[PDB]
Amino acid sequence: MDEKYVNSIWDLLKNAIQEIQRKNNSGLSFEELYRNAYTMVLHKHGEKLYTGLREVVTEHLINKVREDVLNSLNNNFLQTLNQAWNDHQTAMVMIRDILMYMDRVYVQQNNVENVYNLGLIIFRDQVVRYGCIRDHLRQTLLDMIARERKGEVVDRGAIRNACQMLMILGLEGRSVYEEDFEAPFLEMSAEFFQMESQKFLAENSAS
Amino acid sequence: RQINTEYAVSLLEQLKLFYEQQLFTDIVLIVEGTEFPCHKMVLATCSSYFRAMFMSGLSESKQTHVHLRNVDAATLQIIITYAYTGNLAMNDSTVEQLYETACFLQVEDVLQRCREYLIKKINAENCVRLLSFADLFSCEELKQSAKRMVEHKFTAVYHQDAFMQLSHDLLIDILSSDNLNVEKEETVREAAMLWLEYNTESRSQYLSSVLSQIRIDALSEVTQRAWFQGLPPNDKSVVVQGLYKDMPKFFKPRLGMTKEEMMIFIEASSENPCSLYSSVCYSPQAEKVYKLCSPPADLHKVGTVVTPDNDIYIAGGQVPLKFRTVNCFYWFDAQQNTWFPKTPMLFVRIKPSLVCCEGYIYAIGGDSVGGELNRRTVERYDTEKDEWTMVSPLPCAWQWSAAVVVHDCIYVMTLNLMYCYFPRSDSWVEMAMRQTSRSFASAAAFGDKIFYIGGLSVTVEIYDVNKNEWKMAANIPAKRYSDPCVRAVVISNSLCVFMRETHLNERAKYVTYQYDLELDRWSLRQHISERVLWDLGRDFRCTVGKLYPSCLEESPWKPPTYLFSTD
Amino acid sequence: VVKEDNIEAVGKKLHEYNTQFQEKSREYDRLYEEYTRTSQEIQMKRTAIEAFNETIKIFEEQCQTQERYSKEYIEKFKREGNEKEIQRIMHNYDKLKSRISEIIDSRRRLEEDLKKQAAEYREIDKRMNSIKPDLIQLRKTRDQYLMWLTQKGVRQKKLNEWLGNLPHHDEKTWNVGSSNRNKAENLLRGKRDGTFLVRESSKQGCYACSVVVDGEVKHCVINKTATGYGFAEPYNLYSSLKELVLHYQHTSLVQHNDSLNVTLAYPVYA
């Protein structure tokens, strides 16, 4: 009812979701949380919650993820990439299970996306679609497929996890996959096929 | 291969038997001190809440005691009973708390069942409370239904205490709607005034939003009273179906300023090959005919009844053999042109004499003679309790009898006798007999005078309620060598008879006459040409009611002139 | 008839012009229905536009009533340094001017609707004036072939089957419900021996079987006993107006009337 009461509930929810993002959600009681949420949303306070969701998860992302995968960059890039990917996936699934009633009542009102789609969108844009990480990931993928073409064996698990998470980030299909990975892949494959054809037809017979 | 059914029901009954004796109880729910042992799997499969709480893998799936707050013990018990059985025992006393508890556990099945139950239970008393409930719990279907119900009877529900405790959004969305059934804008103005003065200290800041929604410069139907009524005969209804349509919706005449008194014809023979048992209405003031989607289940043999509050109902009748008799009760939505079914009757009837008395609709006779005490039964419906109650049955089995209501008293007439029923006494009293024995006659109530007209040969017999005496008035001017068919209906605060006459080698003719009670003379009122009208048959039922032509239906289905007099 | 005399191929002409003529009557009454609907539409539109006019007039009356209020009771609402009290005529003035503007726009919309419907009505009305002379001319040719071609061996039933492009098992075919003696004579006017119908007799509760016998429509009242219907009395056990009534059709008892050996072999609408 009172605005300070709603603010205290929102701060408790912030502390709870931040503790969950720390991967230490063992000592938490969800009853409390769903309760608080339902209340918030039935107290005519529907968006504050949404926007703050956005904000917090986003902050989390920038800080943590950047640091991690960037410091990787030079190293074990895809390893920590898929690590943070599945960690964020588990965290957002838990948050969706917490805030499912909001996804039921408030999402269909303002035609906005659900918290799961919102989290995947912000992870695709702020974490994946960022400048200094996009070029690095595409160059690493091109390098690993290039060395795969010339005999050097690479762990197919990393590349298959990268491609499956890229096609998952589309939320509709291969939309983002066509522009983030398929567009350089087609041209690099085309030039590689041209080079191999030129080096094959020049000193070999048709047989 | 489809999943087995008998094994499923056996497993369900075995699970119920195990739950009754408390076997394998792995979770213990604590609600306000009361304990409930239960299984986690059943609560997960039924409610999405418990599923998410158990699949999280936290201490909630490991701890046997879970404290659930803000949940009623009775509602939780009903939810568990539904989860272990599959049946929901809902009632009008604990439906809102059950829906609240369900919306907390997201029991899709229970939520949908409670939603449809609340939708089928909106009457003229809970509308505002149910609207506030749906707004608080964000149920779009229930919200829209309650909003339409409030718009239908705003002038009758704006006095309730639930209306003054509404929120700001509810007020600004109700007042802005052009579907307010009000005859004058002063009613809406006074409603807004009482709403703002109910709690001034909290609504003093909303006075601008309140005044911005009430149409002050509309001047809908007063401007016609200023200049003159000079037009073709009663062409004010033309201004209604023109000015009201093209309007920026800020000065729009509300829907209540659009209702027009039209002669409601049901079961009227139709030229339409598919629906030859359709229903149409004619506006004496508009001289125009409008189409109705009246048949909800392509049936017939149903009676008509118009309450003083201008409500239409049909009951009884029989649907074609897929002619099985039914009990369905349908109320007409004058805004959506669609009938909403109600609680079915207790006994099937064919053309039951439906009359409104003291707010109750009574079903009198209207059935084939089966059983001495089994027939002649009379039953009334409760508009708010939504239930049928049996009353003192008819003294004798009659056929083609009519029923009217005068001074909150029930009257049924027959061949030559007459019985008067009193709901306060619940008894039947034989009244003054009639000098003529006739059948298939039509009767209409006009003041303390009952008009019995018909016979299948027309004679106007007047009964006095105050004198309990029958006096002859006249014979309906008509033609013997032809085919007569009269329908006595009261419109424009005047008794009338809509007589359909089929002459020798000629088509059916339609014309409405006006009767003078003082001079005991029948005057020609208005000739009803077949410009938009056609053969309506002989078994059609007729009544008088006010409907909105604005959005009822628009279909001539009859070219005005067709004279190929070119020669 | 293009100087032809094959009779058969010349009768095909009769049927060629047959359809062509008809097509016209359909489009003729269609144009009449269009005329009527356009008439009522322009009637309902002129009433709406005069309503618009009188509303604009009364709104101008309110506009000058505002100037009247600027001298009647404005003295105690402008010199006090308040603006919320004057909103009852000042905030009711600007929105009234906007209402005037938008109803003028609505009147322009109704005027352009009027001119566009008048255009779409006159583009087919001028067509009526160009098809009615052709229609009446085609009628005259049909009447010219109703004097010569018709009398070259064609039947009226053949003409009907050309202007249109057991029957006793159906009841409606002969059953004319409650027709009178006159209607029956008119329906069996110029009919063959055996053409019959089942109407209701003037006697209330009785039926009548009118039938062309030797060129004369004889209305034979049907009786009704406990055993059933029937003409005389010995055979008055007819279950209904079906099985045993069609049984009489095949018996054609002459014991009833000397001129009743002609069997009812042709329903009126066979």
UniProtKB/Swiss-Prot annotation, chain A:
Q: Where in the cell is it found?
A: Nucleus; Golgi apparatus; Cell projection, Cilium, Flagellum; Cytoplasm, Cytoskeleton, Spindle
PTM notes: Neddylated. Attachment of NEDD8 is required for the E3 ubiquitin-protein ligase activity of the BCR complex. Deneddylated via its interaction with the COP9 signalosome (CSN) complex.
Keywords from the named record: Acetylation, Autism spectrum disorder, Cell cycle, Cell division, Cell projection, Cilium, Cilium biogenesis/degradation, Cytoplasm, Cytoskeleton, Disease variant, Epilepsy, ER-Golgi transport, Flagellum, Golgi apparatus, Intellectual disability, Isopeptide bond, Mitosis, Nucleus, Phosphoprotein, Transport, Ubl conjugation, Ubl conjugation pathway
Can you supply one Gene Ontology CC term for this chain's record?
A: glutamatergic synapse
Tell me if S-adenosyl-L-methionine is a UniProt keyword of this record.
Answer: no
Q: What else is known?
A: High-glucose conditions in renal tubular epithelial cells lead to up-regulation of CUL3 expression, significant increase in CUL3-mediated ubiquitination of MRPL12 and dysregulation of mitochondrial biosynthesis.
Disease link: Pseudohypoaldosteronism 2E: An autosomal dominant disorder characterized by severe hypertension, hyperkalemia, hyperchloremia, hyperchloremic metabolic acidosis, and correction of physiologic abnormalities by thiazide diuretics.
Describe the family membership recorded for this protein in Swiss-Prot or TrEMBL: Belongs to the cullin family.
Give the protein name, as stated in the record.
Cullin-3
Organism whose genome encodes this protein: Homo sapiens
Q: What is the lineage of its organism?
A: Eukaryota, Metazoa, Chordata, Craniata, Vertebrata
Q: Which gene encodes it?
A: CUL3
Curated annotation (Swiss-Prot), chain B:
Q: Where in the numbering of this chain does the BACK domain appear?
A: 127-223
Superkingdom of origin: Eukaryota
Give all residue intervals belonging to the BTB domain.
25-92
According to the UniProt record, one GO cellular component term is: Cul3-RING ubiquitin ligase complex
Name of the protein: Kelch repeat and BTB domain-containing protein 2
Origin species:
Homo sapiens (Human)
- What are the UniProt keywords, alphabetically? Kelch repeat, Phosphoprotein, Repeat, Ubl conjugation pathway
Kelch repeat ranges, renumbered to this chain: 311-359, 360-408, 410-448, 449-490, 496-542
Swiss-Prot record, chain C:
Look up and give the organism this protein is from. Answer: Homo sapiens
State how changing residue 199 to W affects the protein, per the record: In SHORTS; impairs interaction between PIK3R1 and IRS1 and reduces AKT1-mediated insulin signaling
Describe, from its UniProt entry, the tissues in which this protein is expressed: Isoform 2 is expressed in skeletal muscle and brain, and at lower levels in kidney and cardiac muscle. Isoform 2 and isoform 4 are present in skeletal muscle (at protein level).
Assembly and binders: Heterodimer of a regulatory subunit PIK3R1 and a p110 catalytic subunit (PIK3CA, PIK3CB or PIK3CD). Interacts (via SH2 domains) with CCDC88A/GIV (tyrosine-phosphorylated form); the interaction enables recruitment of PIK3R1 to the EGFR receptor, enhancing PI3K activity and cell migration. Interacts (via SH2 domain) with CSF1R (tyrosine phosphorylated). Interacts with PIK3R2; the interaction is dissociated in an insulin-dependent manner. (Microbial infection) Interacts with HIV-1 Nef to activate the Nef associated p21-activated kinase (PAK). This interaction depends on the C-terminus of both proteins and leads to increased production of HIV.
Q: What is this protein called?
A: Phosphatidylinositol 3-kinase regulatory subunit alpha
According to the UniProt entry, the note on domains is: The SH3 domain mediates the binding to CBLB, and to HIV-1 Nef.
Q: How is it modified after translation?
A: Polyubiquitinated in T-cells by CBLB; which does not promote proteasomal degradation but impairs association with CD28 and CD3Z upon T-cell activation. In adipose tissue, polyubiquitinated by the BCR(KBTBD2) E3 ubiquitin ligase complex; recognized by KBTBD2 through the SH2 domains, undergoes 'Lys-48'-linked polyubiquitination leading to its degradation.
Q: Which family does it belong to?
A: Belongs to the PI3K p85 subunit family.
Q: Which residues form the signal peptide?
A: none
Give residues where Phosphotyrosine occurs.
32, 145
Q: Where is the SH2 domain?
A: 174-268
